[PDB]
Design a protein around this ligand. Structure first.
Ligand SMILES: O=C(O)CNC(=O)C(=O)O
Ligand SMILES: [Mg+2]
Ligand code: NI
Ligand SMILES: [Zn+2]
Length: 331
């Protein structure tokens, strides 16, 4: 069995290997990459996402979110407070302000220490889930707006034709902006490209060990767990690496820098934080190997998780028994 310790693998495809996206995912899996839950892909030196980032300041962040924490430094939740609209240029100036900018630090490890010590005492502002793309239309390789769609994958594998669409989303981050522990909707894959700016640190639990993380989370967030049998779908809970180590949870960590892709694999729990002002693009995708995970994915039906239109079909076709309850949670 390849990669039996479930380490995060880093790939360096050639320009020729960069042509066929599906083939390369399947290659990474042949080498055991999925066992980690996360892989990094460094694009060939000849590749670029677009020519420059000099003209992005007028993108609008219609609903910036202030991430307010509650709990203790290593075990906390966050809620998202809506803020007034602002442009990317206004958000960048805010991220760089004395109140929000990255502190002086020695290296990524020092900054990680500072994040986990001090995150809860601040409320950074995040642009999230902004439909759109920064890939040039002429970029043919690994263009996250030109991927094969999940609806087409389901039709190819299963024969069933369904409604829905699959488009990318932009994220604008600053120091301490945080992504809570989660798997993707319907335990899909994700791909994330860091277009510009400062790094993103990721933590990940191997898919084969995800239920260990879920059991710890039920222990650490006991009221949330009573409220919902899939409360990690709410995407609000944080647990530090120190707490995961104290509790014996298998995990790995890696830092993504600008110009790098990350792929998350089905049922790979992940969480992390941004180092400073940045812009990322991400989208969910499927392969044939996903189908079995989609059929088994947990679902939130308490009303909190509320998700896209296109997840309806996935539940309806893959999880007909759960469909009525889950749709009630949507309405
Ligand atoms: O850009 C981001 O914060 C969030 N990304 C993820 O959790 C992902 O791509 O799967
Ligand atoms: Mg612009
Ligand atoms: Ni994710
Ligand atoms: Zn719920």
């Amino acid at each position: 069995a390849q990669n039996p310790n479930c380490n995060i693998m880093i790939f360096h495809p050639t320009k020729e290997e960069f042509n066929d996206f599906d083939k390369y995912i399947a290659y990474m899996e042949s080498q055991g990459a999925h066992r980690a839950g996360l892989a990094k892909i460094i694009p060939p030196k000849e590749w670029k996402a677009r020519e420059t980032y000099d003209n992005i300041s007028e993108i609008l962040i219609a609903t910036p979110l202030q991430q307010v924490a509650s709990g203790r430094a290593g075990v906390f939740t966050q809620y998202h407070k809506k803020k007034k609209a602002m442009t990317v240029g206004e958000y960048r100036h805010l991220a760089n302000s004395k109140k929000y900018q990255t502190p002086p630090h020695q290296n990524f490890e020092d900054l990680e220490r500072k994040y986990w010590k001090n995150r809860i005492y601040n409320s950074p502002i995040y642009g999230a889930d902004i439909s759109g793309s920064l890939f040039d239309e002429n970029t043919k390789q690994w263009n996250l707006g030109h991927l094969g769609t999940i609806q087409d994958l389901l039709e190819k594998e299963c024969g069933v034709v369904i409604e829905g669409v699959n488009t990318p989303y932009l994220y604008f981050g600053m120091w301490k902006t945080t992504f809570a522990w989660h798997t993707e909707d319907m335990d899909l894959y994700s791909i994330n490209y860091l277009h510009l700016g400062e790094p993103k640190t990721w933590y990940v639990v191997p898919p084969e060990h995800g239920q260990r993380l879920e059991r710890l989370a039920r222990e650490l967030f006991p009221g949330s767990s009573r409220g919902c049998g899939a409360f990690l779908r709410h995407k609000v809970a944080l647990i530090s690496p120190t707490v995961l180590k104290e509790n014996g949870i298998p995990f790995n960590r890696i830092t993504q820098e600008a110009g790098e892709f990350m792929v998350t694999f089905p049922y790979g729990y992940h969480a992390g934080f941004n180092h400073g002002f940045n812009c990322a693009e991400a989208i969910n995708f499927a392969t044939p190997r996903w189908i079995d995970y989609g059929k088994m994915a947990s679902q939130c039906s308490c009303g909190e998780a509320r998700v896209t239109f296109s997840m309806d079909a996935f539940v309806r076709i893959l999880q007909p028994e759960r469909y009525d309850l889950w749709k009630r949670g949507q309405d």
